[PDB]
Design a protein around this ligand. Sequence first.
Ligand SMILES: [Mg+2]
Ligand SMILES: [Mg+2]
Ligand SMILES: [Mg+2]
Ligand SMILES: [Mg+2]
Ligand SMILES: [Mg+2]
Ligand SMILES: [Mg+2]
Ligand SMILES: [Mg+2]
Ligand SMILES: [Mg+2]
Ligand SMILES: [Mg+2]
Ligand SMILES: [Mg+2]
Ligand SMILES: [Mg+2]
Ligand SMILES: [Mg+2]
Ligand SMILES: [Mg+2]
Ligand SMILES: [Mg+2]
Ligand SMILES: [Mg+2]
Ligand SMILES: [Mg+2]
Ligand SMILES: [Mg+2]
Ligand SMILES: [Mg+2]
Ligand SMILES: [Mg+2]
Ligand SMILES: [Mg+2]
Ligand SMILES: [Mg+2]
Ligand SMILES: [Mg+2]
Ligand SMILES: [Mg+2]
Ligand SMILES: [Mg+2]
Ligand SMILES: [Mg+2]
Ligand SMILES: [Mg+2]
Lengths: 65, 185, 56, 144, 134
Amino acid sequence: GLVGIDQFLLKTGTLTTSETAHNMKVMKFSVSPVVQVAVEVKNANDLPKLVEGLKRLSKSDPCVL
Amino acid sequence: PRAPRTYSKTYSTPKRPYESSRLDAELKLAGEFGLKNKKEIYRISFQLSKIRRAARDLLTRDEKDPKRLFEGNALIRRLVRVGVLSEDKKKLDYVLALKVEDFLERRLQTQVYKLGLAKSVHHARVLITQRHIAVGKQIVNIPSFMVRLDSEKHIDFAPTSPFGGARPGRVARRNAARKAEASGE
Amino acid sequence: HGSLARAGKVKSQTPKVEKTEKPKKPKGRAYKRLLYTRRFVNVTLVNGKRRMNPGP
Amino acid sequence: GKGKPRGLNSARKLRVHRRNNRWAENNYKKRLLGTAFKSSPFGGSSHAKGIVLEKLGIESKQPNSAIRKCVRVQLIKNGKKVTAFVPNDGCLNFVDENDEVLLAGFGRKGKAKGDIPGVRFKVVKVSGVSLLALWKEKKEKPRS
Amino acid sequence: SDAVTIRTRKVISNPLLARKQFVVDVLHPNRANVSKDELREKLAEVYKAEKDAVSVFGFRTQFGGGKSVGFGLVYNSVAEAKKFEPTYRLVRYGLAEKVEKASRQQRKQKKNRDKKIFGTGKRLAKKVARRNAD
RNA sequence: AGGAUAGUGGCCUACCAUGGUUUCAACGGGUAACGGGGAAUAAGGGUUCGAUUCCGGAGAGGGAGCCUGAGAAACGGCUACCACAUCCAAGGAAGGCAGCAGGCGCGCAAAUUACCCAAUCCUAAUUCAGGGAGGUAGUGACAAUAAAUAACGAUACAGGGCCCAUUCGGGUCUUGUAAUUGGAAUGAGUACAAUGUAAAUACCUUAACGAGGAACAAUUGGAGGGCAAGUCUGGUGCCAGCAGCC
Ligand SMILES: [Mg+2]
Ligand SMILES: [Mg+2]
Ligand SMILES: [Mg+2]
Ligand SMILES: [Mg+2]
Ligand SMILES: [Mg+2]
Ligand SMILES: [Mg+2]
Ligand SMILES: [Mg+2]
Ligand SMILES: [Mg+2]
Ligand SMILES: [Mg+2]
Ligand SMILES: [Mg+2]
Ligand SMILES: [Mg+2]
Ligand SMILES: [Mg+2]
Ligand SMILES: [Mg+2]
Ligand SMILES: [Mg+2]
Ligand SMILES: [Mg+2]
Ligand SMILES: [Mg+2]
Ligand SMILES: [Mg+2]
Ligand SMILES: [Mg+2]
Ligand SMILES: [Mg+2]
Ligand SMILES: [Mg+2]
Ligand SMILES: [Mg+2]
Ligand SMILES: [Mg+2]
Ligand SMILES: [Mg+2]
Ligand SMILES: [Mg+2]
Ligand SMILES: [Mg+2]
Ligand SMILES: [Mg+2]
């Protein structure tokens, strides 16, 4: 594991030190973000903590959109 | 924690920003002495003001105030020691008269032009800058330097570098390398 | 109502025009040499009074 | 005799009357009462982040006619909801819904720039990046 | 060695440290600064105590070349140097060999781990031996 | 009067007396208040600040208590309650970063989980050991100092001082415009080595490599007024937008 990297990563990535190393293959998996739901906060003041949270949740898992 | 470093501002910016009178009078002083910023001017007028500040504050003390005589000498001792105060004007409050120009005259940058040696004040600046021209054992490359007049005849091109013997320079060096390559061998 | 609809309107409409490669303008001391010269001796732009822009 | 006392022993009444009369000075009164704490959508700070609730259009004051293109923001620290002008041509299109913005004051210590009624803030950064740097196509809104 | 002219100002005799202390002032035109082991013997002959017993340090070369300024010492003997001298610079001179150690952070950890054992620590070395796994 | 303290004292207790403060502002309320040396702005007078390198003081999640000791009502000590909260085999155990890094949270708003006692000083049984005190380096456009981004010829031209003048100028000093070319200087980089330093890094010294302009290429704001600087061109047509104020 690496620390201090997370804030630059959405879900995945390749780390290189070459001036011109390429990316890495995109991990074809089987399941898909197909079953959706709708969310908002019970209390309106909490929306900022919700929009931040949704970015944080999207890092949690490799699939959730 | 260990003690604070003290530091100070060397310059002070004008109050009215767009009086052409000051804008032009500044630019004349630039081309004349080969300056770039108004900071170069501002630094000097701030010095000059930080100096009249002491000067008017001593004439208010009556003659024979031991502080008046003591730093009155100390001042002028430092001011014809550089040539920004002329030798006769050593008298007390000729100091209040100086404009900035007397300082830009005593700048190192100007002397290297007013002592032959440069052909143009803009040529003087870069001559100082590029590790040429020195005083004694000491090599100096700060255009604003305040030559002490003990030295305006103790400053020739430096012991190192061309224009001063003692090694040939490095642009002619590569230029004359191929002088023996397109000459057959 | 009275939507945004038209936000970029003029900027999106103003026809693009390009900049042009130019003689590089000097920087530093050398530039105030130019202001000195271009205002005091061989300033080939004066016009009777002291004016800093021509509409020829 | 010029209204005020002059005696060498009237320091009290002199000092206490400036204290009384400093209160008719708006800049003093706003400070001592701390209305930048009690009032004042920002905490008394210079800036404030906020979540964009919705784009919004405001007709200018007369003699002028135009639509000024504000957003409505909920301040993160506050809950308080405010409107902010978005500078320069187009440039409302850079603001989506519920992306964070940094707002500044309007260079007016409250009040409001000429045209716009009741707007005392301006967007400065959106989605973390400088607004001007988006206007000039010099920086990019962060990736999805 | 281009006109090395290795001067030596402000000298005085120091029996309390069994050595004589002084500042060095080397000129060297066209000669871009002068080394230390080099400098150590060019005066190790001057007051020829052993070469292995003369010490110098400081040395900011001056501006525009052609000069440098250090500080030096000459000891009465080699053995009076090794003894009184800074243990760290005896090894640049070579008269001492460097002491490998463990990293400061890493030895600090061991200190705090041994604060957890009270006795010799070899009492518990055997209680663990019997049990685990019965 | 005693009691208690290291000791004065309503410090506390018994007895007694009815005193003590206040418009020269007591008491109470507020402070986005630790005091101070000091900082910013200063014709003079003033105004605004001071958490923060020194000094004094207070605190060690909130309170109280207490052991040890010359010294603590100590928190990198213990005891209890309160708030938060970790581990577990559910019987039980342990906790205190407003110390150094590092993280969450908070926000407009603030750096490395790095090296070392070499210096500064401190401590101990002690020249030796320990020291996130402190020093080093990392990060850092907070502030502050200095100050490269060109210099100088020639070609031609617009010309501009000019000795002769029936002379178009028969000599010219000077100035710059146009890719018209030319050889000199150089550090920014990079880099021998040495120097630097506890060991390195950068600096200073410096071998070799490092300038033609298409690069070694400076931006930021603006050109109606205030206010230095366009009655240029194109676009839009009270729309877009600008605009501190007009
Ligand atoms: Mg050189
Ligand atoms: Mg009133
Ligand atoms: Mg009131
Ligand atoms: Mg009234
Ligand atoms: Mg933002
Ligand atoms: Mg008593
Ligand atoms: Mg407080
Ligand atoms: Mg205060
Ligand atoms: Mg202030
Ligand atoms: Mg304070
Ligand atoms: Mg505070
Ligand atoms: Mg601090
Ligand atoms: Mg303190
Ligand atoms: Mg305490
Ligand atoms: Mg805490
Ligand atoms: Mg305690
Ligand atoms: Mg403590
Ligand atoms: Mg602690
Ligand atoms: Mg900051
Ligand atoms: Mg932060
Ligand atoms: Mg030490
Ligand atoms: Mg030690
Ligand atoms: Mg540091
Ligand atoms: Mg700076
Ligand atoms: Mg504009
Ligand atoms: Mg104007």
